[PDB]
Amino acid sequence: DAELRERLRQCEETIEQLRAE
């Protein structure tokens, strides 16, 4: 389940950054 979990983690980080911008 490493792949899906890391994909979701990266998506959450990118969403955070995009919302800040």
Contact residues toward its own copies (CB under 8 A) are 1, 4-5, 7-8, 11-12, 14-15, 18-19
- Distance of closest approach, residue 17 Cβ to its own copies, in angstroms: 9
- In the complex, least distance from residue 21 CB atom to its own copies, rounded to whole angstroms: 8
Round to the nearest angstrom and report the end-to-end CA distance of the chain.
Answer: 31
| CA atoms of 6 and 17, how far apart (whole Å) | 17
CA–CA separation, 1 vs 7, rounded Å? 10
Q: How far is the CB of 3 from its own copies (least distance, A)?
A: 9
